[PDB]
A paper describes a structure:
We adapted our HTRF assay to perform a high‐throughput (HT) screen of small molecule inhibitors selective for CgBdf1 BDs over human BET BDs. We repurchased and rescreened these compounds and subsequently tested the 12 most potent hits against CgBD1 and CgBD2 and the corresponding human Brd4 BDs. This revealed 4 non‐selective inhibitors active against all four BDs and 8 compounds selective for CgBD1. To better understand the different selectivities of these compounds, we determined BD co‐crystal structures for the non‐selective tetrahydropyridoindole 29 and the CgBD1‐selective methylpyrazole 63. Structural alignments reveal that the binding pockets of CgBD1 and of Brd4 BD1 and BD2 can all accommodate 29, explaining its poor selectivity. The structure of CgBD1 bound to 63 shows that the latter's pyrazole 2‐nitrogen forms direct and water‐mediated H bonds with Asn209 and Tyr166, respectively, while its carboxyamide nitrogen forms a H bond with the Pro151 carbonyl. The oxadiazole and two thiophen moieties pack against residue Met218 within a shallow groove defined by residues Lys147 and RPF‐shelf residue Arg150 on one side and Val214 and Ile215 on the other. Structural alignments predict a severe clash between these moieties and the (W/Y)PF‐shelf residue corresponding to Arg150 in the two Brd4 BDs and in CgBD2. These observations highlight the initial residue of the (W/Y/R)PF‐shelf as an important ligand selectivity determinant.
Residue numbers in the entry: 127 to 237
Write the structure that this text describes.
Amino acid sequence: GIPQHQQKHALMAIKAVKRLKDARPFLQPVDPVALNIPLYFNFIKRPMDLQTIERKLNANAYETPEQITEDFNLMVENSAKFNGPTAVITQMGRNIQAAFEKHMLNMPAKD
Ligand SMILES: Cn1nccc1C(=O)NCc1ccc(-c2nc(-c3cccs3)no2)s1
């Protein structure tokens, strides 16, 4: 797992993103049948959401900050594939992706 200071930085980035209206579609895992999109898991083989990223950070399940960035990008790209590249949800994902990248560019180095 990444050292404490990087873990803290990523956690603060995630909390900042969670505060945003544009995060609302991404706060929790998708339940396809509950949303009457039963083909979701046929299209999306690696579901991802903000709660999972935060829990993984708390579980020290990331080895590098780039893995966090990869999971965030995967979440947004899942929306791009399933809802469409210009769908409302996808553009909200692009917005919070920009916010998260702003917070992650400032990630402190190991040494
Ligand atoms: C199928 N899927 N892929 C990624 C995410 C999803 C999905 O459906 N998650 C459940 C949702 C919760 C809130 C959503 C939403 N809130 C809004 C708006 C609020 C205010 C202005 S827009 N738009 O969507 S979606």
